[PDB]
């Protein structure tokens, strides 16, 4: 029973390394200690950034969109390495990804955040929190909720081996609307839940009920997403490019 | 074996169940017993249409409104009851006054909708201490915006009731709901988290022992917290609209203080 669960843990972790270029391990190294990133702290510093790495605030947002679409391909490859996933009804796989990705993006985005800013482009840059907060409405509020969540989320001190399994748990959520066959999704999630429990007990013996606390964060994650999606539609204020993004 | 520290957790379990039973009149057990015909004396008058609604009133303005005004005052009671239960949670009354208020402000609706689920099945919901049963479709027939305020509540109830929890499982879970450390504006978060740590341990155990054959009930239950939170967010939305269309509808000042800047 409990050796199957380390396999699953190990399998997911290795797949997490293959699929994601910038790991929490690597992200944490850059936010702390020889090859620092370029800091974007104000209007002028963002200018030289493009030189290095319509208007300012729109050009940032679009940057998040290119990024996001890349992420979605990374998350999709990962998912397909989660056992059982690819033997599910295809409409469900697409449903699971369609509804899961925002939740995964802001989870892993936390890896790239401290209470002062977020690392960008493979950790070549850092965009400060108070700068993003200065951007003209409605963009100034776009990232603060994410920052508020990353503070809370990062306090759990999870590492990549923990996060890998968590992500799979998010993917395999059997409450997504319009799913045709929920049984095996729940069956896989149960198994992922067991693996996560054990992982967190063996990797963080001293953190009591870390499993519980981590799952509780799901509640804040989904608010984050609903809120952000609202913002997006409100934000409707190149043809073939629109289509991509 | 069960060990000394799990002994303490089982004790916490008992205390809480007992307080739950003392602070809440209609338990899930009474609810089920009414809804599933264990009954020649406990059967409810069913409301499902306008005349039956009229016939029910032995046991004024207009209907959709009169129903919501009823929900208002019953929720006010519930807040009292939950406040009573909260006091009994070891540690809660010792916290900073302001946090006490904060935790009830955000806990209360999530607990109401957890317990409303015990009084529901797919076809309707018990009302008035379980003497009446108001059908789901009758509620849906209510005029906009009111035919929309309870569906989301049913969708959750049928999902939630599928976990098959009992009052002794619910007592610990509602404690966990109240003592949550990521509520906005709390002064001191560590104390609250240490209490929840204990509550979560107790729950984890109670579920294992009470439901030994169900895999990961603990987790599955914690996941339902996201559903509650979305029910509460959507509810508050809908209040906003009611206030604007019905300029003559009174809201209770207690409930208004809870909704204020959620
Ligand atoms: C164990 C805790 C039970 C808590 O019950 C409820 C709590 C809250 C709500 C929604 C409220 C809306 C303001 C809220 O979420 O704040 C809705 C409910 C459920 N409603 C009722 O229990 C209820 C419904 C109708 C009535 C009647 C009784 C009688 C006179 C009048 C008209 C008609 C005949 C229905 C009210 C009384 C209670």
Curated annotation (Swiss-Prot), chain A:
Keyword Amino-acid biosynthesis included in the entry's annotation: no
Motif 9aaTAD location, chain numbering: 239-245
- UniProt PTM: Phosphorylated in basal conditions and dephosphorylated when treated with the ligand. May be dephosphorylated by PPP5C.
The UniProt entry's GO biological process terms, in alphabetical order, are: BMP signaling pathway; cell differentiation; cell fate commitment; cell maturation; cellular response to hypoxia; cellular response to insulin stimulus; cellular response to low-density lipoprotein particle stimulus; epithelial cell differentiation
Where do the annotations place rosiglitazone binding? Answer: 65-68, 102, 228, 245
Keyword Glycoprotein assigned: yes
Record location of the Glycyl lysine isopeptide (Lys-Gly) (interchain with G-Cter in ubiquitin) cross-link: 18
Q: Where is the NR LBD domain?
A: 4-245
Compartment(s) of residence: Nucleus; Cytoplasm
Summarizing the annotation, the consequence of altering residue 18 to R is: More than 50% loss of ubiquitination
The record's Gene Ontology cellular component field reads: chromatin; cytosol; intracellular membrane-bounded organelle; nucleoplasm; nucleus; receptor complex; RNA polymerase II transcription regulator complex
What's the domain of life for this entry?
Eukaryota
Q: Which UniProt keywords apply?
A: Activator, Biological rhythms, Cytoplasm, Diabetes mellitus, Disease variant, DNA-binding, Glycoprotein, Isopeptide bond, Metal-binding, Nucleus, Obesity, Phosphoprotein, Receptor, Transcription, Transcription regulation, Ubl conjugation, Zinc, Zinc-finger
Please report what switches on or represses expression of this protein. (Microbial infection) Expression increases when incubated with M.tuberculosis or its lipoprotein LpqH; induction is TLR2-dependent (at protein level).
Give the principal location in a single coarse category. Answer: nucleus
| Single GO MF descriptor | LBD domain binding
Q: In which tissues is it expressed?
A: Highest expression in adipose tissue. Lower in skeletal muscle, spleen, heart and liver. Also detectable in placenta, lung and ovary.
Subunit-structure text: Interacts with FOXO1 (acetylated form). Heterodimer with other nuclear receptors, such as RXRA. The heterodimer with the retinoic acid receptor RXRA is called adipocyte-specific transcription factor ARF6. Interacts with NCOA6 coactivator, leading to a strong increase in transcription of target genes. Interacts with coactivator PPARBP, leading to a mild increase in transcription of target genes. Interacts with NOCA7 in a ligand-inducible manner. Interacts with NCOA1 and NCOA2 LXXLL motifs. Interacts with ASXL1, ASXL2, DNTTIP2, FAM120B, MAP2K1/MEK1, NR0B2, PDPK1, PRDM16, PRMT2 and TGFB1I1.
- State the family named in the UniProt similarity comment for this chain: Belongs to the nuclear hormone receptor family. NR1 subfamily.
**Linked pathology:** Defects in PPARG can lead to type 2 insulin-resistant diabetes and hyptertension. PPARG mutations may be associated with colon cancer. Obesity: A condition characterized by an increase of body weight beyond the limitation of skeletal and physical requirements, as the result of excessive accumulation of body fat.
The job of this chain, per UniProt, is described as: Nuclear receptor that binds peroxisome proliferators such as hypolipidemic drugs and fatty acids. Once activated by a ligand, the nuclear receptor binds to DNA specific PPAR response elements (PPRE) and modulates the transcription of its target genes, such as acyl-CoA oxidase. It therefore controls the peroxisomal beta-oxidation pathway of fatty acids. Key regulator of adipocyte differentiation and glucose homeostasis. ARF6 acts as a key regulator of the tissue-specific adipocyte P2 (aP2) enhancer. (Microbial infection) Upon treatment with M.tuberculosis or its lipoprotein LpqH, phosphorylation of MAPK p38 and IL-6 production are modulated, probably via this protein.
Its UniProt domain note says: The 9aaTAD motif is a transactivation domain present in a large number of yeast and animal transcription factors.
The protein, known as: Peroxisome proliferator-activated receptor gamma
Q: Which organism is it from?
A: Homo sapiens
Q: What is the lineage of its organism?
A: Eukaryota, Metazoa, Chordata, Craniata, Vertebrata
Q: Which gene encodes it?
A: PPARG
């Amino acid at each position: 029973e409990s050796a199957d669960l380390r396999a699953l843990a190990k399998h997911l972790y290795d797949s997490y390394i293959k699929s994601f270029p910038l790991t929490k391990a690597k992200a944490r190294a850059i936010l702390t200690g020889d090859k620092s990133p370029f800091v974007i702290y104000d209007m002028n510093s963002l200018m030289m950034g493009e030189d290095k790495i319509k208007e300012v605030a729109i050009r940032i947002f679009q940057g998040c969109q290119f990024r996001s679409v890349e992420a979605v391909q990374e998350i999709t490859e990962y998912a397909k390495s989660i056992p059982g996933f690819v033997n599910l009804d295809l409409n469900d796989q697409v449903t699971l990804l369609k509804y899961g990705v925002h939740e995964i993006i802001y989870t892993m985005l936390a890896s790239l955040m401290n209470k002062d800013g977020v690392l960008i482009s493979e950790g070549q840059g850092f965009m400060t929190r108070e700068f993003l907060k200065s951007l003209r409405k409605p963009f100034g509020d776009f990232m603060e909720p994410k920052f508020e969540f990353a503070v809370k989320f990062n306090a759990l001190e999870l590492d990549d081996s923990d996060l890998a399994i968590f992500i799979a748990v998010i993917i395999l959520s059997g409450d997504r609307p319009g799913l045709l066959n929920v049984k095996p999704i729940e069956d896989i999630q149960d198994n992922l839940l067991q693996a996560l429990e054990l992982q967190l007990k063996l990797n963080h013996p001293e953190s009591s009920q870390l499993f519980a606390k981590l799952l509780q964060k799901m509640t804040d994650l989904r608010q984050i997403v609903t809120e952000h999606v609202q913002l997006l539609q409100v934000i409707k204020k190149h043809p073939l490019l629109q289509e991509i993004y």
